[PDB]
């Protein structure tokens, strides 16, 4: 016969970074022309 009681506290922290990029294949850029 054996009986035990287990107590514990768990602590943790986190930290994250992200980076994204989106593109449209239909309108990918806009052009400007200098004319005379």
């Amino acid at each position: 016969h054996t009986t035990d009681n287990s107590t514990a506290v768990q602590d943790s922290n986190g930290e994250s970074w992200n980076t994204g990029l989106s593109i449209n294949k239909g309108e990918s850029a806009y052009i400007n022309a200098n004319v005379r």
Binding site: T3, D4, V9, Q10, S22
Partner: protein, 38 residues
Amino acid sequence: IVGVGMEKLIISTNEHASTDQGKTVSRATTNSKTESNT
């Protein structure tokens, strides 16, 4: 007498593409206790 003649066709695929990336850092601490009786 006026007519129209077509020379070539160009297709612009209306599509949207995205790219994501990330990083994560973590750290856990646990201090367990046990009292065994027999």
